[PDB]
Amino acid sequence: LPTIALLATGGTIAGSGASLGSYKSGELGVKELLKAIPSLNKIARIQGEQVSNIGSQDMNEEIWFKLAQRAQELLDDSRIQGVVITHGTDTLEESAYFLNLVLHSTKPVVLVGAMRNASSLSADGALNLYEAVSVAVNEKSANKGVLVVMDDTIFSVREVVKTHTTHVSTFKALNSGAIGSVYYGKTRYYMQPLRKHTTESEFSLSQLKTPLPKVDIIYTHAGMTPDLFQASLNSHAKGVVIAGVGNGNVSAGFLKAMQEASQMGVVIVRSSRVGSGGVTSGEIDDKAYGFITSDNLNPQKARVLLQLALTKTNDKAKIQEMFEEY
Amino acid sequence: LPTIALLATGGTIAGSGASLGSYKSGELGVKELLKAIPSLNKIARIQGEQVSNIGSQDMNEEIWFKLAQRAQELLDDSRIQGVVITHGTDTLEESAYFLNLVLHSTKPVVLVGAMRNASSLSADGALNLYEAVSVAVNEKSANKGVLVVMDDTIFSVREVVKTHTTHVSTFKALNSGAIGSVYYGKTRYYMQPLRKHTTESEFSLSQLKTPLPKVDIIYTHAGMTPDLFQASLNSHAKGVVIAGVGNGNVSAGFLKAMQEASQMGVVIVRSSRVGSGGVTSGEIDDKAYGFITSDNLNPQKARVLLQLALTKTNDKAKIQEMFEEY
Amino acid sequence: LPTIALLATGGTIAGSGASLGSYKSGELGVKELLKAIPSLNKIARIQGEQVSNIGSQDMNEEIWFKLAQRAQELLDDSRIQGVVITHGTDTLEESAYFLNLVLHSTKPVVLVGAMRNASSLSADGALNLYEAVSVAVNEKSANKGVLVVMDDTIFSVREVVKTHTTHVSTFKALNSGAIGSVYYGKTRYYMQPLRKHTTESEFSLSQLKTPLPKVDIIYTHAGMTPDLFQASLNSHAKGVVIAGVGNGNVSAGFLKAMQEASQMGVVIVRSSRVGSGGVTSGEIDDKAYGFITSDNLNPQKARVLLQLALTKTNDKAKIQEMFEEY
Amino acid sequence: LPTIALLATGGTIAGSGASLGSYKSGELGVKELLKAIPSLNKIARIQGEQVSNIGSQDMNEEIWFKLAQRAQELLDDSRIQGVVITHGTDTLEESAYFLNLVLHSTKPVVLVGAMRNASSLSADGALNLYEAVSVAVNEKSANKGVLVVMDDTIFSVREVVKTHTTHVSTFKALNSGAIGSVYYGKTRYYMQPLRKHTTESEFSLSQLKTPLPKVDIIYTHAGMTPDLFQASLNSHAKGVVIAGVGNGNVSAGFLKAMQEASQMGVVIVRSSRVGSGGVTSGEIDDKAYGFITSDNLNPQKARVLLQLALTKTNDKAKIQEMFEEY
Ligand SMILES: N[C@@H](CC(=O)O)C(=O)O
C-alpha cells in the first residue's frame, strides 16, 4: 500500500471531553484519530505524527513554518506518497493557502478537519479523515496544488473558505467551485486549478524566515473612521489589507489615510468583507494611489499572499501581478 | 393612487458618468431616477426628496439620523402610505437594520439600490426601483419591519446581507431566506420575520443622540495579535465586536485582552468573519467573562445593535437578551 | 417530561448492513434508533412505533394515509405533546407537504431522516433525531405547520426540498429559507410560514380516501414530444403537472396537447424542472387555456396539492387560488 | 480586430413587444441585437446570422444539427476567431452540452441569453452579449470546451444549469463551479474543465444523423407507477433516463420494469430529480441489471450524452465509461 504521512495539528477533529458539544479543540493525540476508522489500513500505511496540538484559532507562523518544513521533508522522501494534515477548521483555509504557496512538490497534500468534536453524536471527523486519506493516495490528486477535503468534497486551497459558524458543510468555494468529489473514498475530479501553486510558485520555505512582514486586516462599516488603520501603521505594519464594503470601498477619510500610508511605502490591499467576488478598480483608481486589488481573495487569504509578497518586493506592480497569478 | 415618499441618499443607483463601469457613486439627483420608469405613475404618487447624495461607503450617523428623522416624520403623516429609500448597496444592510430598530410605524419602509450604475449597459436600478415602489404600496408589506427589495426579491432588514462584490444578485439572506418575491411588481410573501422590529422595538429616535456609543469591529486571522483590539480600547470604545474565526473564536492572547476589557466595563461581542450561522458558547464560556454572543448577526449588524444597546444599558445579561430578541 | 410519539417509516436513518455505504434503506426497527442517543431520555418520554419499514422511494398513498391517521390520532390525545416521524430522505419533502395539508393540530409534527446509514462512519441520524425531538418539544414549534429538521436546521414543510443526491446538508429551502436553527437541541425560530397549513387547511383526512385522483408528472427537454403526456391522458390522469423548461415552458406541440387536455376537463399545472422560483404567466396565457401555475412549488409538491385539490373541485379558478394560498 | 461569428437562434434575449414582461421569446432579428451595444465594434468585427428564431422551449434536433453544422463550418474558417450563439435560456444548457460533445475546434464557442426581454426595464441581454463577445475573443478562452457566459460569469457547458425560473442569475454550476469571471469585458479564468470536450470527443457531426436515437426522461415521486415508463418503451425508446428520487432511486415496481427493459436491450440511465450531486450505486446494484449511473449530469444532460452514446454502441460498460469521461 502507499504510505501517507499524517501530520496532526489539533482542531475540533481532535477535540473531546462531549456528545452534545462541550469540548476543547485541541485535545486527543494523533494516534487515537486512527483507531476509529481502520478500513484505513486497507488503503494506506499511515505514518502519523504530532506537529502541534492546538485549536486553529491559535495558529501562528511558528507552527506554519514547523508544519511546512515537516511537510516538505516528507514530500521530498521517496517513501512518502502524500501527506494528510489534520487541522482545526477555523483557520484551515489560511494554512491551506500558505502551504499552497510555499510547498514544492507534485505529491498530494490534503488538509482535513471536523466541525463536530470527536465524541459528539454524529461526529463528522472519521469519514472526513477516511476520505482525505483516499484523496491523498489517488493518482489524479497529484499536481493540483494543496487540497482540502471536507464533507465528501474536494477543494483547491486558494478557493476554499469556511462560510458558516457550525455547519458540517461550512467549507465552500463561492467563486469557482469544488474541484472534485469523494464519496466513501471514491474520488473524482472535474476541474484543474489554474492559479500558480506549489511547484510553480516563486515562494519557497528556504527563502522565508519568521517573523514574516507584519500585515494587519482592517474592517469597515458605516460610520467607519481610520483610527484602527492608523494604529496598524503606528505598530509598524508593512502591509494592510482592508476588508472594504462592497467592491473594496472605504470612506473618504479612510481613503485619504490609505493614500498617505501608500505614499510612505506601506502596501495597501483592497479586499472585501462581503465574502465573494473580485475587487476591481473603478470607484477607486488604484493605480493613482499605489493600491493593490485583492482579486477574489478574501481578507485573510489576501493577507497570506501579501505577507509572502513583501518578503520579495515592495514594488506595487509586481505585487498586483502576484495577485493576478496566485 | 397611494402616495409613496422617496428618500434619496445617493449610491450606484444614482451613479453616473459610464456604460462599461467608470462612474461615481453618488451623482444624479432624486428626480432623474424617476424619469426612466413612469409606469410608476400608474402605481403611486411619488413624493421625492434628497436626504443626502453620497456613496454608501460614506454613510455615517449624521446621515442615519437625518434619514431616520425624515422617514419617521413622513410615516407619521396620514397622507403618506409608505417610504422608499434609495441607497448605495455597500452599507444598505446596516442602514436597513438601524432603521428596523429605530423607526416606529407599521407602514412599509423599503430600501433599494443598484449594483450597476444608471448609465451602464443593462443597468439594474430602474426595475429594482419599480419593484421597490410596488412592494411599498402593497397592503401585505405592512407590519413586517423594514424591508429591502433587490433583484426581484423581498428581504427583511435583519436578515439581508451583501454577499458579493459586484453581482446584481449580491443581496441574500444566508440564515433565514427572503420573505417574499416581487416580479414586475407582483408581490408575494411567504414568511413573517419574528425578531422584534419597528413598533415592537424599545429603541426610538426620540431617545437617541449622535454620537452613538463608540463601537469598533476587530478582524481575526491566523497569527492574530490583540494590538488593534487594544488600540480600540485606547480610543475609548464602549463596545467591541470581534469578527472571530469560525464560531467566534480568537487566540489565547486575544481572549485574555477581551477578558480584561470586559472586566473594565467595555462590552465585548463575539461575532464571526465567516458570513453565516449563529455564534454560540462552548469553546468559550461567555458567561464566565461577561461576553455577548452575536446570534446570527454578522459583525456590522452586531455593531448596529450594540451601539443602540449601549444607549440603554451596560448590563451584559440585558444586552445578551437584546441579541436574543432583535 | 413531555411525551413525544415517534412514528418510524424506514429510510436510510434506519438503514444498515455498512460503514462505507453498502446498506438497505429500510432495515432496523424503531427501537434500535433510540439506543444510540439517550440523552434523549433527558428531554422527552418517547412513545415509539413502526408505521412502515420501507425506503421512501416506495412511499405511496396507503402508507401516507396510515401515517396521517396515526399521527392525527396521537395529536388528538392530550397525553401526546408532539410527533416525530422518521422517514427516508428521498420523498420526505412530499410526505411532509402532504401532512402539512391534511393534519389538523397545532402541536408540532417533525419529520427527520439521515443521509448516511446508521452503521456508516460519521452517521448523521443520531444527532438529527436528537435535534428533531428537541424541536418537537419546544413550545415555539407549535402552530407553524409540519416541520422538517435536518442537519441542525428547521424547515417548514412547504419550503423544504432535497437538493443533492448524497450530501448530509441536502435539504434546503431555495425560495424562502429555513425558519429556524437547532444546535445540539437549542432551538431558535426566525420566521413564521404564511401559506395555509394544518389547522387552517380545508383538506382533512376525514374527507379523503385512497386512491386519490391520479396525477402524473411529465418532464420536458429539447426535442420533447407530447407522447408521454398523451399516455398519461390515456391512463386516465385527472391532473398532470408539467416539469417545464425555465418558467414552466413547453414546445408548441406540447402546448397544443395541453390545451386539448384542459378543454376535456383534465387539470394541467405548469411547474418547472429548474428547482426554484415561481412559475408565472406571460409567455403562456394560462387563463386563455385553463392552465394552473404552480407558484414556487416544484413538480412533486405541486402534484401533492393538485391531488388534494381534485378531491374538492374541478374549478380552475378555485385550484389556482389553492396554489396562491397553500 | 478579431472576427466573431454571431449565430442567433431566438430566445428572450431577442424577445419583445414589453417593459414589464409581456413579450414573445423569439421575435427580433440578429441585427437589432447589435444596435444596442457597439462599444462592441471596439472589440470585434461581428459577422451575424440567423440560424433560427424560436423560443428555446421549441429547440429540437433539426435546429441543433443546423446550428452545429454552421458553427463547425465557421470554426473551420481561418478568418473566424470564435463564435457566439444567442439562445433562449430554457434549454441553453442542453444545446451547450450537445455542442460541447459534437464540435471539433479549439476556438471559443460561447452561448449567451437573457432572462428579461430586450424591451424590459433593466434588460440583461445587452451586457450579457457584450461580455460573451469579450470572452469569445480572449485568447485564454480557447481549448476549454463550449462556454456559457451569463450575468458576469463564465461556465463550462457540462457544468452549467438553469436553476431558477426567472432570476437573471439563474445559471449556476452546482457541483463544480464557474470556471471564470467576466466584468465589463475583463475576463479571468480560475479553472480548466477536465471532462472530455470538443477536440477530445469521439462524437462528431460527420458521424451523426437526425433523428438521433429516441431517449425519454421519466419523472419519479411518491406513489409512482411505471405506466409512463412502459409507454416510453412502447413508443420505441432506445434509452430512458430516470429522474429518480434522491440518489437515483425508484419504487420496487419501477425497478422491476427497468430490469426487464434493460434485459431487452433498452439502455436505462439512473439520473436524479434533485438538481445536484452524482448518482452512485449502492442501494441499487447497477451492474446486476445493466443500468448506467448518470454521474453528476442532470436528466436532460444525461439524455444528451445517452443519445450520442447510442449512435456508437449498445454496450453498457462502454456507455458507463462515457458517463465517466464526458
Ligand atoms: N476552533 C476549532 C473549530 C473546528 O476545528 O471546527 C478549531 O479551528 O480548532
Ligand SMILES: N[C@@H](CC(=O)O)C(=O)O
Ligand atoms: N459604492 C456604491 C456601491 C453600490 O451602490 O452598488 C455605494 O454603496 O454607494
Ligand SMILES: N[C@@H](CC(=O)O)C(=O)O
Ligand atoms: N433511499 C433512502 C435515502 C435516504 O433516506 O437517505 C430513502 O429515502 O429511504
Ligand SMILES: N[C@@H](CC(=O)O)C(=O)O
Ligand atoms: N422561453 C425563453 C426563456 C428565456 O430565454 O429566458 C427561451 O428559452 O427562449
